[PDB]
Every structure is written in structure tokens, then in C-alpha cells.
Amino acid sequence: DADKLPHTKVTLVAPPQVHPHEQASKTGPKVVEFTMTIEEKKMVIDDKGTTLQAMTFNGSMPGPTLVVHEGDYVQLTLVNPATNAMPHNVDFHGATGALGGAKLTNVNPGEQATLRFKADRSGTFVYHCAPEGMVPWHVVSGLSGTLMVLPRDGLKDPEGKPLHYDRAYTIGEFDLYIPKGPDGKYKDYATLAESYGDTVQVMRTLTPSHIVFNGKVGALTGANALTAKVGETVLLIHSQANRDTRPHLIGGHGDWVWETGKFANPPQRDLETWFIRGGSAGAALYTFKQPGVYAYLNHNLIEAFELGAAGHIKVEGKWNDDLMKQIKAPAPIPR
Amino acid sequence: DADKLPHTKVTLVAPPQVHPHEQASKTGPKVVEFTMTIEEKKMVIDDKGTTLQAMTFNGSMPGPTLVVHEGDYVQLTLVNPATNAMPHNVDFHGATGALGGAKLTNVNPGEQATLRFKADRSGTFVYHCAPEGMVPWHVVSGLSGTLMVLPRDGLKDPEGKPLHYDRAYTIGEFDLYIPKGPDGKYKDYATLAESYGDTVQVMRTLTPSHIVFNGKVGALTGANALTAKVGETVLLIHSQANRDTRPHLIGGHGDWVWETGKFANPPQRDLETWFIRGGSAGAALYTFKQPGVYAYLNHNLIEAFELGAAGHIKVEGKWNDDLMKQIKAPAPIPR
Amino acid sequence: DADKLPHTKVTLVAPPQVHPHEQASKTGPKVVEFTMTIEEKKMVIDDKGTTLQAMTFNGSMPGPTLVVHEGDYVQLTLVNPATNAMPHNVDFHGATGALGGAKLTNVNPGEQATLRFKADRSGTFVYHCAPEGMVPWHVVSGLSGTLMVLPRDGLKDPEGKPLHYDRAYTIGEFDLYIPKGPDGKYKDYATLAESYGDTVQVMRTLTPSHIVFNGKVGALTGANALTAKVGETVLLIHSQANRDTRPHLIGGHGDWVWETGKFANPPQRDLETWFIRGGSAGAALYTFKQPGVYAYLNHNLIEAFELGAAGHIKVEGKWNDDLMKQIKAPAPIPR
């Protein structure tokens, strides 16, 4: 019985970080409380100055990652401020009933609601907005993120041995549908409502103009690259709420991967490239053995290098000649 | 030896139902006899009045589901009436040899043939027409369905424990390629042969105009919604003979799923969204715990809500506040 | 320590064959030496005379398959002759560090380099060229192939029982992006550099003009069909370095399949159609039980029959009436 359990309040953090949490816990079930606020905002998504009339949870794409343990209850307060123009709600793939909660969280601008559900299944699960008659537009404009429900005794390999991570990162991949004018340049709209009709026409072609990690081309590069060090194990959470993708770490692997994202199933090992189905989140563990700059990308290489689906991980530490060695550097062909 | 076994005759039923059958059986192997008749027919596929020059098994899209047990023999009589214009045949992915049977069932209008094959592998398998030189057109125009071969001792979980369903439903998803004229409206053709050339041109773009469950937009809604009740376990069979899809139950899950559709492999549990490869059938079990109207859809949300890949399940019974509760209804933001 | 182990030199062979090798071996770890030479060349890819300005490893699409055992070291010499125009390198998905080796193998025309890496993970893995700023163009123009790393004690089923193959075949599937002129005919270019700008524009549509096995439409048909015989077990290696595909054997199955391509994971059995993610190689075993001409294809049937993704296997031996029998040949409908 839920209203008799202890409550705890969690403060969310912006992607690509994930808020502090315990993996294996001796703690009993809790009601874990969160809040999120919708923000409609225009956003620059590429190096040409192209804009998207965007819709976000807490101001970011993706929304923040929420983390609980199997058997906890999630209690979310969803706020839709009067500065917004549209109605919104939330569907948790991790929940059971009432269209994932969407039927109980319909909030017009100026309103809020509170939902509770039991997180009775372990894994990474998508959440997204789903207002009647406007579902795909709200999703592709930026309203999605991940709930992670960890098993109470932590992650396990196929033989039941313990697995861990030292840091977690969250990557949301967004297929965007930006309209063009008769001059062949991308259109810039004064309001969110004015972008609607033209955007639906692009969507129906099923061809994205851009595909970006965390809100823009190059979001996870330069000063904003992911980081790690040799010997450290990282969890990479990858959500795609609308379209399939195929993650790959250049110079690495997926040591243990749940591509369907559900921790009660055995992971697979040694993957070069894995597959996240549109409408889900998956998770990969990797332990760095070499330093350097890695690329993490969608391995449809057109989607990655032409359309935007790629980022960087900068890894410090000591080079290992046993794993790889330059025997002869590039030099003229002997004759 | 097959011609020495008992024969039984089965009467097929129209989708989305599946004909009565036993799951676990003590019965020994049988020769199980079926008949199907091809019908070429023009069909309205959307709410605008758009038509498809269609080709069907028994008058429906998909064709009916055929159910036998591992070790039975399937003996099908295929009839091509003289009212049809084209030659046809059948390829069972469940069979071994002769292009799945296609080489032995080539029937011109006015003809019939009878094929027998051993159903020696368990799972859900696609069948489809495949006439030399015209294969993709006949498949995308509607000629596909599912053969289910159940293990003799019923379905099993990864630990070998028994699994069951109380009702089965069959959903065929069809990517359609309808041509347009210079005014930008869909074309209506007087005959099947006249649609051919224009349709090939659309197909080569790889962009469907429509994607529909069971023959039309909204086929599985209103009076024709699927039904169930709290406590009941349903099997959802999903076939796609030409193109990938990603099934999802809104407010539910896949309790146990064989996404590749082959029952001798362990299922996965707790899936949010699964993946049916073009050219296959997969199967999901779910036990309802909450009443209400669920949506069952392809979670490329453009494909579902714009192009047609979505239906409804109406579930009766008692609401469960432990799984989900509205703590505070939508109301003004406190100030 | 690698520079203290025995060295062996291997001679590569052209696809669809794979060079002779042992499956299970009592041999200890070796440094296994290979060489490959890049060849830029114009190539006819269809029956209309269409050309591709191509880039290849050893003159073929795909590149040759390299085979070692888990714990061996791969030592490759990569040569870029002065007759070529562009810089090249190599990224092995099977390797750890330095962008899979790409950072250590940058060779301008007239140069060569030698790389060594430990093949410490079993499976089939893609290798491909990846020059800074030009990655997708070099990959889709033909620069990819497969490294197979076999477990030291051979392939195993989910229960640890031994599995074998009698012959191996390697199939590379290539999505091509050929530009058209204002008359709607495919363009023919005098040099590789002149095709670049127009080709990028086609790539960004994400719609291939052609999809071919081993370099052209019908590559693996007629005199160049694959072969086998009843009772023989074949391994079919399928690589796709840029785009998803869904292999199917018409009249057969995947007896045991590693669709993600990594041999330390249990295979699945009885598959009708499997899935190779863009940016990977997978492997299927099948034992022929019936003679005849099989088709092996991508089961997006438009991609196979309209765009080129299909080949043939000719199988000799004795027909088996227990598995399949024509009960009644095509004949007039009785009245």
C-alpha cells in the first residue's frame, strides 16, 4: 500500500548527466517525487542558423532522466505555465493503465497535475507527450526522455554475476522535420502554431532534414564532449521516441548491451553496433582500455555525418600497445 | 509417413479472429487440410475515398491465420477462379523446398492445385504470393498472411514453465503505394492491370502513401475494436511481409515476446516496443490488469497517426489504484 | 606478448569465397599477416549500363574476408598506390583504440602503413575506410568488408554443443546513391572527384537508387550463383556497413543465426528472416535438405526485386517427398 510508504524528493539534472542514485540498495520501497515544467521555445539546431519551433520538458532535449528502483512508486507533478500556447500531458512507457498516464495529466496552459504509478518492471523506458490529435508533432518537436528502473540488487550478466557502472550518460536522438521555402532555404516561424501545417507535410515524407543528439548538431562535442578515463565503466542510455537508430562506439564495443532496454533479460556481449527501436530506450556498458577521443554515433553514416547523429567521448589515461600498435607509420611504397 | 496418418479438415475464419484450436495436445501427428480462394478486388482504404486495386486470400487483408502443431502436415488447396485476371501461387516461410511451395502451386485463372508440406518447425511464419517477375506488386497489393505452428506441449518461458493465452488476434500491417495525378490527388483505376506501371514508380521511392492494419485506416476501431477483460491473457500475432514495423501497446507491455516469431527460442519479458522484420511474423503475450481503451500501434508515430498504422483494444473490468492513481487532477497552478 | 609469438602469412581470395582456415584449432596464438591494396575504379552496376565511380579493397565489393582465431593478432599492410587520387585508411570494428585503427593508417596516394591489433573478441565484424571529413562517401562507394574471429574451440549452440560448416560464403550488400540529370537518366562521370557533390545530394535523401550484393545487380546469379549439395552445412556471412537489411533464404531457414554477429552469445534457431543492423556483419548456418535453385535476398521485396538485393544458390541432390509433395498439379477447377 503506497500512501503508507516513506516519500523522498529528487532534484533532476540536465542531460547528458543523470541525477545521483544508488545501484544495488538495501532500502525498502519508496514513493519517489519529481516535478517537471514544459517549455515551448524557438531553438537554433545547426551551424547555418536553422531554427526549430521546439517543445521541451524542463527546457532541454531530451527531458531529464528519472531514476528509481523496481517496486518504488513514481509520483510526478507536471506543470504547464500560462506562458505556453498548447495543451500537454505525459505517457510513461514504464507505467500500466490510462494510456501510460496521459488520460490523467491533460494540462492546459496555467495548469498542473500529479500522477503516481508503480514502477514494477525493470529497464530503461521512454516517456513522451501525447495530446489527442497532435501526438507525432509534440514528440518530434522535443517532448521525450527516459525513466530508468534499476533492479533492487543491481544489474546482472547472463550467469547472474554483478555488473556496475561508475558514471551514466543520457543521449536522446531526435529526427527533425524542418520545412523549406521556394528558394530552397529552411523556414523560420514567428510562432509555434505557424510551423504546424508545413511541418506535417515534411513528416509525411518520412525523411528527416536533420537528426541530432541532445538538441543540436554537435551538442556533445568540444567543451561539451562526454568524458571518462581508462579503467572506468560507463552506462550509455540511448532513447529514440519516434524512429529507429543503430548506436556504435568507434574504437570500442558494447561490452554488455540490453538493446530492447529491459534488465530482467540477459544482455548480449561484444557488440559492434546495436539497435534501438523507434519508441524505446536501450542501455550499453563499456569499460575503457585505451585513452583518446572516441566517436559515439548512429551507424547509418549519412544520418551521422551529413544529418547530425554523432558526438564525442574524451578519455584520459595510458596507451596500451598490446591491444593495438602502429608497426610502420605511413611512408612511401618501397621500390 | 504422411499418407498413412489421420486427416482432419479445418474451417478458416476472417481476421482479426483465429480459428479454434488446441494449445498443448496429447493428439499424435495429423494431415491438416485447408482451402483458400484468391480474390482480386478494388477496395476503399481511407476516409477520403481512396481506393486500392487489391489482391487477397479469401477476400481479406491479411489472409486468414492457419494453425497446426509441430510435426503435423499442412495440405492446402489453392483456387484461382476464372473471374480473376492474373496468375498466382503460394510461398510458405514455414515450409522446406521448391521456393516454399511457389514452384508447385502456379495457378492461372480457372485452375487449382494441392500442396502438402511438413510443419517441422514451431513459430509464426509469413505466407505470401510470389509469381515470377511480379513478386513485390502481388505482396504489397494484399497477398499475405500467417501460419502458426504451436509446440506439441504448448508455449514455454525461458525456464521451461508453461505459458498460455485465452484469446488470439491476428494483425497484418500493409505498406501501400498509391499513385497521384498532376492535380496531386490519388488515382482511381478501372482495372488491376492499369494500376501496375504507376504503382511500380511509387514503390521504387520506398515511401508508402498509407500504412494500414487489416486493410484500411481505422479497421480495428469503433465496432471493430479488439476486446478483452481484466485477468485475460491475449496473444497478438503481427505479420509484415515487406517492411519493418515496431509494435507497442499504449498503457501496456509485452509480458513475453518472440519478436522473430520462433517458439523454440526463449522469449523476452517486459518490452515497451518490439520489432517485426519485413518478411516475418512475431508474437506477443499480455495479461490485462487495468480496464479502458488501449491503443495498439506502430511506434513510428508518423506511420501510426498520419499514415494509418494503429488500432484499439477495449478492455472491461475494475480499476486498480495500486498500479496507477491520479493524486491531483488538472487545476490552476497555485500562487 | 605479441612480438614473441609465431608469425603466419595468409593469402586472401575474392568474394564470395573465403580463404582456407581451420575452425576448432589446437594451435596457440599467432600474429597473422595480411595485405590489401586500394583500387579506385569506374564500374558497371546494372543491366542498363549505369556506372558507379567506385572505391574498393583489392579490386572487389565487398573487400575480402579476413579470418583469424580469438587471441590471435591481426597485422595488416594497407597500400594506397600512386595511381589513386584520394587519401584512405582503415577502421576495424573488431579492434580496440585509435578509431579502430583509422588514426594510425592514413595513407596518401604513393604510401603504405602497417597496423597490428589483438583480435580478443569472437564474431563477424565490419571493416571500412573512414577518412576525416569524407566518411560516408568512401563507405557507400565500396570500401567495406568482414573480419571473422572464430572461437578457438569452434562455434557452439545455446547448450554448448558443437556446430560446424562445410563451406563459407561472404555477401556484402551496398546501398548506392547514383545521381540523375534533367533528362531523368543516370549520370556518367569522367573522374571520381566530379561525382562527389551530386552524390552527396542523393545521399541526403536517404533513398538508394540501387541496392546490390557483391558489386552489381545479378552478381550472384547464372555462372556466378552460389553452390551447395544436400546434406552440406553452409555459413552465410552478410555485411552492411551503412544501412539495415533483412536476409531470407526462399525455401529454407536460418538453422542457427547470430544476427548481431557475435559468437559468444547464444544463436537463435528456425528463423525465416533475420536482421543485420547498418554498421555490422551477421552470420547464419543452414543445412540443405532439398535440391533446387534457392533465392537468397533482402526481404524488403522492393529492395530485392526492383533495386537489386537478391542472388541464387544452386543445390544438387535427391528430392524428399516427406518434407514437401505436390498432391495435385495445377488443373481446371472441377465443376
Ligand SMILES: [Cu+2]
Ligand atoms: Cu505536448
Ligand SMILES: [Cu+2]
Ligand atoms: Cu509511446
Ligand SMILES: [Cu+2]
Ligand atoms: Cu499473386
Ligand SMILES: [Cu+2]
Ligand atoms: Cu517471402
Ligand SMILES: [Cu+2]
Ligand atoms: Cu577511403
Ligand SMILES: [Cu+2]
Ligand atoms: Cu564503422
Ligand SMILES: [Zn+2]
Ligand atoms: Zn504517502
Ligand SMILES: [Zn+2]
Ligand atoms: Zn510527499
Ligand SMILES: [Zn+2]
Ligand atoms: Zn528506490
Ligand SMILES: [Zn+2]
Ligand atoms: Zn499529426
Ligand SMILES: [Zn+2]
Ligand atoms: Zn568500475
Ligand SMILES: [Zn+2]
Ligand atoms: Zn567527430
Ligand SMILES: [Zn+2]
Ligand atoms: Zn492420407
Ligand SMILES: [Zn+2]
Ligand atoms: Zn483427406
Ligand SMILES: [Zn+2]
Ligand atoms: Zn495438430
Ligand SMILES: [Zn+2]
Ligand atoms: Zn516489380
